[PDB]
């Protein structure tokens, strides 16, 4: 166990690009929508 | 004040799916710079 820790980290930033990314989407289609509902009347 | 606060949840939702986008790409950055840091030695 002297380089192995590395590969942790490593992993979580995977997980953590990956659902940040998916976040933004989940934001982008509320934004979407509201802003798309809001042009009609 | 009856269909104005919708324009405040908007501008909400607006910040976070730019701010979400970006704060993605800061964990893109430590993901691609530990990956390819332990690709080498």
């Known amino acids: ?5 590395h590969e942790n980290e490593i992993s979580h930033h995977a997980k953590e690009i990956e659902r940040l990314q998916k976040e933004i989407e989940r934001h982008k289609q509320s ?9 009609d009347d």
């Not at 166990?1 to 820790?5: N, R, S």
């Not at 934004?31 to 042009?39: A, N, P, T, W, Y």
């Open 1 to 5: 166990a002297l380089k192995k820790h």
């Open 31 to 39: 934004i979407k929508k509201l802003k798309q509902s809001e042009d």
